[model samples]
Target: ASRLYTLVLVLQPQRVLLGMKKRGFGAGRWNGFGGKVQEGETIEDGARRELQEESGLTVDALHKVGQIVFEFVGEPELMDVHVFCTDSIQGTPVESDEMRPCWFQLDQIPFKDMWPDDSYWFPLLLQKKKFHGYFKFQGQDTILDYTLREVDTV
Candidate 1:
């Protein structure tokens, strides 16, 4: 079994919208939208469900832009993050209980309010490029050590 998720880096000039579960691990930070791949759910199904449920995004295109595998103490147990980006989505994002979607500009990412690892590679995602990384994050505050490498998939 593989734990899976999809993150959409919804963009705007003032801020890039990201979704977070209000009751779960990473909450209140402006991170992309995604969550668990349900039973018998394909990756694409998981992506679509999470994108809409969390961020009210309906995408026409969500491709494999990046992947991350690491040990993080949270949901899905042993972790693997599959990130997707799409410029084509419908509806305005609103705050839900499972998520309180928020926006922050590229430079105004509220670093101190987010997990230590995010600041490192979120910018790459904003540039419309793909990247993957691993971090031995320390309780969401400090990163004990980390490695980031950009990948090309064609």
Candidate 2:
């Protein structure tokens, strides 16, 4: 049971405010700026704080748009994914042990080192068409199980 985090981005004026960092699950890979909820912390709090601490960007608002939970043979977890979107934030992206911030054009994302599925739903997020993506990972590979549920106006 592992939590999923997708910091859905909207197309705004280009700003160097995103990057890949080594932390929790998707470390050392280009991923949305977040991590597992901390002890006694709400998911919203974790999402908000992660945006700031990891990449130096603060979230304006966050809404749950997705979730995923499963177990790998060696990793038994009780994780739940929480997808959040932020259109406005204050601060530029900066590098840290947690993450290194960088700007990638909407069409020029570094896919080779990023999550494999980012290319699929990232466009949907930029278009303001929100949706949920569920997956199970077995040693760096994903197993997708999609459905017919989407969130608009997120």
**Could you tell me the lDDT of residue 7 within candidate 2?**
54
lDDT: which candidate is best? 1
User: For candidate 1, lDDT tens digit of each residue in 73-147?
Assistant: 553454677877666568878776777777666677776666567778777776767787777654666667778
Give candidate 2's root-mean-square deviation (CA, Å).
3.3
Q: Cα lDDT for residue 15, model 1?
A: 66
Candidate 2, residues 60-125, lDDT tens digits: the string is: 676555443443445776345566666566776677778877777766767778766565666655
Candidate 1: residue pairs that collide: none
Model 1 residue runs over 4 Å out of place are: 12-14, 73-77
Query: How does candidate 1 score on lDDT?
Result: 0.71
Candidate 1 local lDDT, residue 22: 73
Candidate 2 Cα outliers beyond 4 Å, as residue runs:
1-17, 63-65, 68-74, 142-149, 152-154
